[PDB]
Design a protein around this ligand. Structure first.
Ligand code: ATP
Ligand code: BGC
Length: 353
């Protein structure tokens, strides 16, 4: 084999031999086609310290970006997590209105290996974005929102933390929800509106909202984008008042109902999650939210909750570098950087009519 033959010369060239005077032997190269993070296993007599000392040389020799070098099952075996020099993805990519999709309902979240990541909300209607504080899971949601505002959609924004993440400029573009009573009224309305559109399609004999809009002129239904900053504000019922938790259990009722029956009604949920918990990302939320955006999660348990795999732990530590799952396949992408005080121009959306 070519790889074993290649690696052998790279080691001979570095005189990278153990106490036994023998070069590391390649046990397995497990390449990921989706994330494109390869897993290079070697068993040598060289200690993990000497390996780490050689990461800059090993990168230049094998032409790889070493994500991590860890010790395997035995103190003889090492595992390298890397990406070839050809798995080229920007380390930083800002937002540009040039990316805004023409097709009403298609949104672009960033750049991948082969092209850009696109989500058609007529096909995949709900997005679950997850990541630690400062990962940029909010940035994505704001960018999806901007693209939909530009597409002329109705926007609702949920942030129970005084609505600080949805400032006075966001307020101009749509309704901002800050309390459980407002969220109760909003989610009840969203279920009623979803059901209202559900019968219009039945009666009109139209597949989606677009197929009805081309049948009724002055009665055109606009897309509804409802972004939730922290699912846990609606999910996590622990601590609140006896009357407040009946309100939260109603919000949870309506949310489940929204995610389940709103593929054709053009009502979309974009949910951010800081702390992936099974009490928050319920199987009802999982079964009905098809789009998964995942930041680097140190734990294997938090990644399984989100992606239904342990891929988030192998993410190269790059600000805005996420994982993307839709259906079975899981891919690596660099999320566009959406700067609020650079790209969010609320008057450009008010001009739209
Ligand atoms: N795509 C990106 N490229 C480069 N840097 C990024 C990117 N996304 C985020 N960052 C940086 O990290 C910061 C984190 O911002 P952000 O508020 O979106 O993250 P968050 O804490 O996970 O979400 P939230 O506000 O909902 O708590 C950004 O302000 C920016 O400095
Ligand atoms: O929050 C619910 C309210 O949202 C508004 O955008 C609508 O115009 C109202 O009809 C609705 O009752």
């Amino acid at each position: 084999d070519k790889r074993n033959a290649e690696y052998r010369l790279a080691f001979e060239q570095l005189n990278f031999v153990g106490a036994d005077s023998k070069t590391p032997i390649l046990k397995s190269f497990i390449e990921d086609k989706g994330t494109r993070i390869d897993e290079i296993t070697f068993e040598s007599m060289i200690p993990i310290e000497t390996w780490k000392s050689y990461i800059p040389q090993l990168q230049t020799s094998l032409n790889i970006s070493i994500i991590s070098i860890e010790q395997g099952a035995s103190k003889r075996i090492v595992i390298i997590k890397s990406m070839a020099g050809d798995a080229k993805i920007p380390k930083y990519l800002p937002w540009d209105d040039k990316y805004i999709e023409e097709q009403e309902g298609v949104v672009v979240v960033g750049q991948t290996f082969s092209g850009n990541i696109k989500i058609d909300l007529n096909k995949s209607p709900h997005i679950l974005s997850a990541g630690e504080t400062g990962s940029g899971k909010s940035v994505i949601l704001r960018c999806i929102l901007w693209q939909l505002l530009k597409q002329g959609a109705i926007a609702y924004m949920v942030d129970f933390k005084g609505g600080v993440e949805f400032g006075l400029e966001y307020e101009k573009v749509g309704q901002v929800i800050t309390e459980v009573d407002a969220a109760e009224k909003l989610f009840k309305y969203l279920v009623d509106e979803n059901a209202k559109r559900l019968k219009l399609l039945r009666e009109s004999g139209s597949k989606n909202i677009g197929e009805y809009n081309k049948k009724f002129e002055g009665e055109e239904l606009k897309r509804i984008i409802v972004v939730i900053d922290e699912l846990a504000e609606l999910m996590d019922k622990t601590g609140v008042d006896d009357e407040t938790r009946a309100k939260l259990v109603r919000i949870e009722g309506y949310t489940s109902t929204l995610a389940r029956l709103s593929r054709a009604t053009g009502i979309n949920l974009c949910i951010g999650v800081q702390r992936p918990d099974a009490k928050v990302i319920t199987g009802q939320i999982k079964n009905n939210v098809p789009v998964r955006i995942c930041g680097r999660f140190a734990d294997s348990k938090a990644s399984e909750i989100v992606l239904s795999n342990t891929k988030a732990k192998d993410l190269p530590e790059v600000k805005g570098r996420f994982l993307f799952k839709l259906g079975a396949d899981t891919v690596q992408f660099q999320a566009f950087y959406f700067d609020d005080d650079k790209h969010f121009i609320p008057n450009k959306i008010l001009k739209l009519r």
